[PDB]
Design an enzyme around this catalytic site. Structure first.
Site: not given
Ligand SMILES: CC(C)(COP(=O)(O)OP(=O)(O)OC[C@H]1O[C@@H](n2cnc3c(N)ncnc32)[C@H](O)[C@@H]1OP(=O)(O)O)[C@@H](O)C(=O)NCCC(=O)NCCS
Ligand SMILES: CC(C)(COP(=O)(O)OP(=O)(O)OC[C@H]1O[C@@H](n2cnc3c(N)ncnc32)[C@H](O)[C@@H]1OP(=O)(O)O)[C@@H](O)C(=O)NCCC(=O)NCCS
Lengths: 430, 428
Positions: B15, B71, B95, B138, B180, B259-261, B284-285
């Site tokens: 990837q 090759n 690689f 991964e 990836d 953080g926020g809520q 929400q507050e």
């Protein structure tokens, strides 16, 4: 020595993580970055989850090093006019405020082009313009839910039964610690902005880069879109935990800690797991050298048991195999387990806690984790992910709110009277 | 198109490098993919859904490229590689460690072959990491970068529905390709930055990104939390506060919001049989009143035990449970519509099937249907939109489809091309 973005002027007109993180990277690569923030309070990260009462929060300093802070109320005619001068000054404008905000401020893309035809305008929203969710509040976790990540992260329900599962059908979508919605969207925005900046050298024209958080999450889940198409056509996913003892539906299921195409693996308990949330390793059961794997775990008998010795036969018995490995390492720390399995070249790796990462000397030596001198705070650690052979960023303190307002105004051509006037009229302060 | 005329070699697999190279081709670059003879990129043969067609893993990562079968361990193949490198503006490689060097292609040599070459190299870890030996898969990257440690559930109080029993809540892998695809994005950023600086300096450079570092970068907030933790001993917004205990490192927080809520992933009608009958919801507050109405708890609007964020901390999971109760009889879409009426922030958990079939995503060009030989169409993803142009996404190449074509552009005579082929330098 010389930095690739030297002399490129950038406005960070956003908050939180997507836009500021991209703007921080631009500054580190040489850009002249000014951050225009709302009066009195500035970027929301300044005041979110402070660990030092009188100082800017770490959320802010870890996203805004090497920027100059301009306090400005762009919701006033005088403020808008200043912003318009900034826009003419800049090569790059980045914003991630709520849908319609720029438009209500007087700044359609059409208008922005009128002000500055060289302008490269990068804009982030939760969802594409045409989305039925365009009116949804675009938090980090909302983007993860919208982009396929929570749907496909966590445990499945039912067989095959495994220790980490919740009881019954209580295994639900799980949020990822990684900022798929925030910083990752910033990366996508930076890709578009830098592509545009290069193209501008030949055309002289700016343009608009748009990235939605849902789309950026989906891009990182490209393999899950791959699996969805396989599932619809084939009816099953051979490398998934549910094959062959569980059940597939019409959509890609959660797969726990599964390894994926051609490299089956899992995260395994080590000694201490009951009191240490990180006493774990990741281990692969590779589709070659089964002999050494058998010896490492004390199952020499399996090297010949027809039920194991072919890549495609142990395909069906993986969870028994994982259990045998955990039994073999149940007496070893994660570092001891890795060292034991490495003896035999069984591919494996420790799960590293943020404490171990934060303290890692090799990450300091490479410049990946950098200690930064910050006023009112002392020092703090930040991450610098991409290495260049030609130069190394000099990472400097994040600005106090409005620390550079008058310096930048002066740089824009405002006299001492207009500057005092703007601050008098509460355009540059609260 | 902004990368028109830019010449790119995809000398990678899986990837990281191929995804970066695909984006480059979409933005106008002339991308050639140098692949080992016979099998090519590992993605071609991995989990094929159509037996004699390239796997979707490959097609979704290699549109708009030309395939050169070569090759590069032979002296003839090396010579060809060197001509490509001189032709190229950009060379991308992922690689195993030391692989380029074993061929003789050190950075020191590449700089001399092409002083304008921008060289992007991906590895699992930095060159001086104690894990430098470890195979960079991964899940390995996610484990080394901090992601698995901080993704999943905590153990013990507060007890919640989705927990494993006892101490069986461990590190968890994310579906997102943190190790990836995410690494290829970081690589692309550095490559485009150097491409631009080259305009002024006239010289190339090397961009290096480790998978561990790219993962860590997406977990920037968790390194933030580690420093907060080390300074104050707790994290206000985490589920463990106030009723659990914090240790010396950032713990897993389940479906907690940042953080926020406060927020969480809530069951909707059908969760017992539909893995995706869920929504995400924030408490929400502001508008606590409507929130209380929304859940049939008007009782709570005036209750000082509830009508303030601070009083709610001690029993946030009681709150979430009440919301679940209120939407127990509604699909996720119905739950969303109900909760939106009261201005409570929420959104559905979408399945891959739902995403793949979404008309808005086809209409915006985010999910793009591509015509592919031996297969018909498949869907791919194009995430960044430009006002200046729209990519014309086309079929991934068959293995060696363009070998002789590219060699001719590089100035090889038809006779050289034929011998290269007959001697099996350009085929198996
Ligand atoms: C994160 C988010 C949900 C924040 O919500 P919010 O705080 O309620 O709203 P915002 O901060 O975005 O914007 C609020 C207003 O402040 C205004 N504003 C921004 N900068 C200002 C300034 N310097 N002076 C005065 N006003 C300003 C905005 O124009 C907006 O005006 P509006 O009332 O016309 O909409 C929102 O920014 C968003 O959805 N962003 C899109 C995607 C994104 O990047 N999210 C980031 C975190 S995951
Ligand atoms: C993915 C990965 C683990 C695969 O390991 P691998 O299959 O054992 O080895 P590779 O595919 O990388 O390389 C094998 C050899 O083929 C060689 N090779 C590559 N292209 C070739 C070609 N066109 N012709 C001949 N040989 C070629 C390589 O030079 C390498 O040579 P070596 O024996 O001297 O080391 C490894 O490539 C890797 O660690 N890459 C770095 C980080 C990365 O992006 N990993 C991706 C997965 S998340």
């Amino acid at each position: 020595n010389s930095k690739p973005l030297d002399g490129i002027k950038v406005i960070d007109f956003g908050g939180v993580q997507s836009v500021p993180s991209a703007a921080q990277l631009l500054a580190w690569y040489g850009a002249d970055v000014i951050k225009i923030e709302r009066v009195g309070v500035g970027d929301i990260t300044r005041n979110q989850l402070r660990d030092i009462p009188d100082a800017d929060a770490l959320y802010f300093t870890m996203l805004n090093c090497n920027k100059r802070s301009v306090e400005l109320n762009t919701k006033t005619p005088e403020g808008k006019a200043v912003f318009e001068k900034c826009i003419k000054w800049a090569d790059i404008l980045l914003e991630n405020f709520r849908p319609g905000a720029m438009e209500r401020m007087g700044f359609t893309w059409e208008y922005l082009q009128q002000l500055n035809p060289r302008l490269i305008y990068g804009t982030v929203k939760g969802f594409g313009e045409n989305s039925p969710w365009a009116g949804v509040s675009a938090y980090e976790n909302v983007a993860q839910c919208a982009g396929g990540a929570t749907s496909t992260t966590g445990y499945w329900n039912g067989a095959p039964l495994v220790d980490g599962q919740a009881p019954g059908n209580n295994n639900g979508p799980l949020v990822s610690a990684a900022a798929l919605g925030d910083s990752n969207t910033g990366n996508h925005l930076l890709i578009g902005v830098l592509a545009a900046l290069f193209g501008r050298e030949r055309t002289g024209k700016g343009q608009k880069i748009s990235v939605s958080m849902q789309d950026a999450v989906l891009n990182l889940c490209r393999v899950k879109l791959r699996d969805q198409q396989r599932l619809e056509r084939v009816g099953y996913l051979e490398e998934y935990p549910q094959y062959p003892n569980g059940k597939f539906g019409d959509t890609v299921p959660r797969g726990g800690n599964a390894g994926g195409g051609g490299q089956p693996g899992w995260i395994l308990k080590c000694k201490g797991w009951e009191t240490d949330d990180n006493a774990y390793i990741y281990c692969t059961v590779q589709e070659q050298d089964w002999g050494p794997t058998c010896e490492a775990i004390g199952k020499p008998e399996w090297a010949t048991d027809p039920k194991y010795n072919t890549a495609k036969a142990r395909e069906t018995h993986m969870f028994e195999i994982f259990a045998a490995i955990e039994k073999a390492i149940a007496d070893k720390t994660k570092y001891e387990a890795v060292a034991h399995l490495a003896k035999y070249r069984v591919p494996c790796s420790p799960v590293l806690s943020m404490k171990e990462i934060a303290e890692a000397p090799d990450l300091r030596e490479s410049g990946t984790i950098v200690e930064v001198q910050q006023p009112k705070r002392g020092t703090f650690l930040t991450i610098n992910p991409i290495k260049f052979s030609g130069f190394t960023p000099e990472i400097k303190a994040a600005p106090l709110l409005g620390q550079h307002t008058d310096e930048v105004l002066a740089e824009l051509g405002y006299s001492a009277e207009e500057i005092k006037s703007l601050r008098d009229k509460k355009i540059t302060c609260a």
